[PDB]
């Protein structure tokens, strides 16, 4: 029993973390085989970070302008190229700790583990979700750029996020491992703003199923609802709309607990209306929305 913000074990990613320095700018890089991936704004100076021309900034660099440290050993850069907002530095040594991996672009609502790093060394690991406004609520300081988000379902590391920047509200933005940003953000310090952040509704329902699985039922009620009536209520609390696809996703949890998806949707409507009245659900007084249906099944049933 029990339910925790559970990250994946970080060892497979730790062995890939390196430091990348260009001039006086430094951040983290991801060392897989003979390629080191890092955010391209490492080729920026202190000035020229508002409207950099990365193509022009990169063509002025030689391979020896990139200093890559893997622990105590400096990697020899023998090649460099740019893919979207990510730099790909070819090195003359394949990382012997390279695990089985793949690159995956995720959709809002998806969760992943973050190994926050500074100077190529890990600071800690925590769990995150792609918010509907395409930000993440991370824990990142200066120098954390290059830290990655990942999942390790089975024996393959699925890299889904590379960290780049912090927005004025303290939320964070970055790219997939192909360098394409999540959301409309750009790797410039020009003024940008995250849209209104909404609650990941399907994740909340999954979390309520996890509570029921762990023996908690106080929040249920005898009511049901139509999908359309629920969404008309949900939108009033800045909740993401619930689609038929989400309903289907919750089928297994619905079948495991014997509570229909639309019945649990009725429960959620009452919880938003009442609050929790001094009670908690799985150790929380808010409705947790960073657990997917897949996360619940992995943690509760195995």
């Amino acid at each position: 029993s029990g339910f925790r913000k559970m990250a994946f074990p970080s060892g497979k990613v730790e062995g890939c973390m390196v430091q990348v320095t260009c001039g006086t700018t430094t951040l983290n890089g991801l060392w897989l085989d003979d390629v080191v991936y890092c955010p391209r704004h490492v080729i920026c100076t202190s000035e020229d970070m508002l409207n950099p021309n990365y193509e022009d900034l990169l063509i002025r660099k030689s391979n020896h302008n990139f200093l890559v440290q893997a622990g105590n050993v400096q990697l020899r850069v023998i090649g460099h190229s740019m893919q979207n907002c990510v730099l790909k530095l070819k090195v003359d040594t394949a990382n012997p700790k390279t695990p089985k991996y793949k690159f995956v672009r995720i959709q809002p609502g998806q969760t992943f583990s973050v190994l926050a790093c500074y100077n190529g060394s890990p600071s800690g690991v925590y769990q995150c979700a792609m918010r509907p406004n395409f930000t993440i609520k991370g824990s990142f300081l200066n120098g954390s750029a290059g830290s990655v988000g990942f999942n390790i379902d089975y024996d393959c590391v699925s890299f889904c996020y590379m960290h780049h920047m912090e927005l004025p509200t303290g939320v964070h933005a970055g790219t997939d491992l192909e360098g394409n940003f999540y959301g409309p953000f750009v790797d410039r310090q020009t003024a940008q703003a995250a849209g209104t952040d909404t609650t990941i509704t399907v994740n909340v329902l999954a979390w309520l199923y996890a509570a029921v699985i762990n023996g908690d039922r106080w929040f249920l009620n005898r009511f049901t609802t139509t999908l359309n009536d629920f969404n008309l209520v949900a939108m009033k609390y800045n909740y993401e709309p619930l689609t038929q696809d989400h309903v289907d996703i919750l089928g297994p949890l619905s079948a495991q607990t014997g509570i229909a998806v639309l019945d649990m949707c009725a429960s959620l409507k009452e919880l938003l209306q009442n609050g929790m009245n001094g009670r908690t659900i799985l150790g929380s007084a808010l409705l947790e929305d960073e657990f997917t249906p897949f996360d619940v099944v992995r943690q509760c049933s195995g």
Partner: peptide, 8 residues
């Protein structure tokens, strides 16, 4: 402000 989170 918007901060690219490299270090200097």
């Amino acid at each position: 402000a918007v901060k690219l989170q490299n270090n200097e």
